[PDB]
């Protein structure tokens, strides 16, 4: 059987309450032992080890945990015995973690993120099936060199493309600019596409000596907008600002003036959009070269923030950062 | 022929350059005369008058223009001769203006907003067809008491439900929580549903004596979030804050603490979501009663902001504002 | 507590195996007693009675069962004590049954159809939550006069609009031309729209004395198509044919010739589309008046078949049937 | 400039009426000269030659035209000077032609299909932009070895995945199981994914000596279904039958019996679904091995028909054809 490590970042996503007997096997973490008792079929698929990386809701995630997680995944995948890693994660910020890992994990071995939109104690809990399917995706031969993926609701999503698009639905994850790369239905894994954007082993980013990430704020645009939030971000030491613009990345005029001042001060200003899908394009209404801004193209604000944080570990140059957005 | 007024808020959405002869008829505004020359078939459908309300891109919209527009629409629809109004508008913030009018226009006569995702001078410009269809919707007997609608890409969307969900596509408008209420295909209008949430003549809001709207800021949530933007909004005199939360409206802990302090000071804090669709629900992970927050339910951040601005013209009471979010 | 009857058309959609004790209460049907044991929370919401109408997979449905079901629902809802009916049904043809009931049930009281895309013995079975939500929708005051609805995956779909759009997903039901009319999330029911097309008490159709429905076949169009299936339908005594055309209802020329001959013989030919969404329109490429065909407008082939079957109980007149398609 | 050939299969998709002067250049086909006059910017991108392959609406397409087109495309792409082919085509059956070419063109050079949902003479015609973008996709370096693509509405779709999913909308094309592989916005081409299913140079099929394709019929399933259409297809010499089944490919019992008899006679029976998306899976409710059927997995009925036609040029063996459906 293949060997896989499950890294937990919070509580259990499958099952509820205490186990009906004390397991003889310890996987290495109580959360993971609880998963193996809730979804016993996973033991027939792989030898499972477990680790508790953090113990939080995903809305409490920080860069410090991202760095810890990425360094550990890199260590685990460098081991000959370890065939893949599965990370159990809260759904709220799963897309941000997945995208961060997709640029920092230096391996072709599968890395699968999975969660649950319903509590494990709920009627019709989705966690058990989501986990079972995640293990099957982690051990599949075709999963190699696909990048980091999210497995939810019988679907396999590329980390660059995935987002949570609904507050409550079991089918909340989507890839609105490209679609799922594959499917997993009662453990049967099939891929139909793959990303052509560089990831994992092909990424230029290396976080192995980084202890803290650069500060990047996100602003939400609207009619009758303001300069005071730009100013407060600058005052708090923001190294970058993602602006979630109206339509195709458009600012209100007062805010634009403030962003232009931020960019001149050396804070990188990257234009995204509040709309949900599509590219925030170059050479539309905003003269990015004249103002000193980067266009984020086909991302969203929260994933753009992750990429700009990584870029800022290397450079604050506008052209070099535009090239990063136009590559990854 | 029915009499309709077209109100322009910027430039032409159809045609490009100068007219091939000087019209004998003036509709009342040069922009509208240019529309009638670009889409001459509309003159066979209605007697068209025109007015220029503002001359801006929609990313430059302000509450002052919203108030001017709402008061003028109410004046026009009070005239016996005027059967409907059409408003030409930039796409970026069309959903905000439409939602504002849906709660402030005191009439059952149709109010249609229309725009264009491509320039009128572009190949395959969408403005001419969008406008032709908009006039057909405005004059249709079934359009009475539907509320304010957006007509784009052969679709009729209810203002409560409509949003721009893509940066560039001609089909960028959607109603992600309910779908379009009708269709309009080469001018043939058909309704399949109507909103059951109160609007227009049934709305409690009245802006006839309001000269300035309450300040309401929007915040974009993310991992490793901050208190400084909350604090800057408070300092700039925000009467309300929309928080675009992670997942089902969840804040990061530092931010939650700052929002709790805002709410205690009498600034209304309303929880929405950054995700794009679904309800930001009551009685999920955030104890709204204990912290002093409102749940915005099935809106999005930018329409929640419009409703909170209107609510704040009447009250800052938490319970009363929750009832308003649960009604409209 | 309100009184509701659950009518089963096959097996259980929630739970698996035998009950852990023999219930003292009999609801009136073993399948329903099994549902009450699998989802005990439903007993706190309503007094439940049960009946077994048929015992089949939905792919085995026949007009005979539709007639039995419709007559029984009409009898139950005529009783003062009965507040609503819930029908448990296989997903495959749930849309056809729902649409048939929406034109034949002469009552404003709620009629809710519900099923499960996963077996009740599966990990993460959706039936328990789907049923719980269905009962909550059946007892809600706002559900009155909404027509027949389908409740799946936390969504409320109007029967006229609903379809199964995916082979396996828990989120397979959709309303592709209009969207869901409401939501139901852990039993909390909210409506946002309603149909404006006539249904239930406002329908002209009455099946109380009908023992067998007219035969209507469906044909699937494609390049290099044929006349032999039209001919075989005619030979088998088809009273109507739904043609699932290419694009906006277009036939291949050989097939068109055969359909024109069918229509001249008195068999009603109604044009739908194989594409999945949108209206099959009048006055596009096919001259329906000259050829003797009906355009089905905003339906799909299988729901068009249901409406044409009902129309054929009354008339074979082309204009009268076009009016039926353009009304319901 | 790169040299590209445009092959027309019907009339012009852009422009309308006569040219304002007689061109000095002939591209080689009057339809193509009319395109170059309607969209003159294309002449700055490439040296364009033109050919008229057929003169029909796409609803009149036959296997004979598919064979002529595939052989000609193979001849052209074997020429050193020819960098790509563009094919103008009716939208109704564009997905079938594209899928056929994707399995029969023996080249990595780009092959782009393009059409228009509105007439060139319409207001807001989409053909001019669609064609401009199609030429930009054809000449882009990243378009090599992507397989055959459909370019519509600013989107690049893989032929294996693309379908017309709406009767009338300009955004009618979709890839419901995977999404678009790239974008093209005012000629700026970007790819985000590529198909991992074999195509073009990697396909086993070769049509160079085939003069007529095997007959394959499609049947539309429904409640109270019949055996007479199966029987008529057999009688007309069908070598294969695609069954568009209820839900996950389920037949009605009478029909299943007739299909079992067909399969025993050596007619290949392949199960697809009427639903619109998802896989028609193996090992669900239908025992394919026992009955002698193939599961078409993640296609739709009309593309399953194209693949079964090509499979039947080589074999009628059940297992071998299941492998073909599981590969391509
Ligand atoms: N708030 C939870 C949501 C979930 O996991 O569904 C989390 O993000 O940790
Ligand atoms: N930025 C423009 C976009 C458009 O109209 O499409 C506006 O909102 O005014
Ligand atoms: N074939 C089953 C499918 C389901 O219920 O999910 C039925 O239609 O009865
Ligand atoms: N019926 C036309 C439709 C179009 O091109 O949009 C065809 O397929 O040729």
Numbering used by the authors:
A (entry chain A), B (entry chain B), C (entry chain A), D (entry chain B): 3 to 330
From the paper:
For WoA-P121, soaking the crystal briefly in Asp solution was sufficient in closing the loop. In sharp contrast, the structure of WoA-S121 crystals soaked in the same Asp solution, despite showing clear electron density for the Asp molecule, adopted the open loop conformation. Thus it is logical to conclude that the efficiency of active loop closing on Asn for the WoA-P121 and WoA-S121 variants would be comparable. However, as previously mentioned, soaking a WoA-P121 crystal briefly in an Asp solution was sufficient to close the N-terminal flexible loop (closed loop in pink), while multiple attempts to soak WoA-S121 crystals for many days or even co-crystallization of the WoA-S121 protein with Asp still resulted in the same Asp-bound open structure (open loop in wheat). An identical Asp binding mode was also observed between the WoA-P121 + Asp and WoA-S121 + Asp structures, despite the former having the closed, and the latter the open, N-terminal loop conformation. Thus, ambiguity exists, where on the one hand kinetic studies detect no difference between the WoA-S121 and WoA-P121 variants in their ability to hydrolyse Asn, and on the other hand, crystallographic studies show the binding of the product Asp can close the loop if the amino acid at the 121st position is a proline but not if it is a serine. When the substrate Asn is in the active site, hydrogen bonds between the substrate’s amide and the hydroxyl moieties of both Thr14 and Thr93 tether the N-terminal loop to the closed conformation. In contrast, when the product Asp is in the active site, the hydrogen network between the ligand and Thr14 is broken, hindering loop closure. In contrast, when serine replaces Pro121, a major stabilizing factor for Tyr27 is lost and it can no longer compensate for the lack of bonding between the ligand and Thr14, resulting in the WoA-S121 + Asp structure adopting the open conformation. To our knowledge, the WoA-S121 + Asp, WoA-S121 + Glu and WoA-P121 + Glu structures reported in this study represent the first L-asparaginase structures caught in its fully inactive/open state in the presence of product ligands, while the WoA-P121 + Asp structure is the first closed/active state of WoA reported so far.
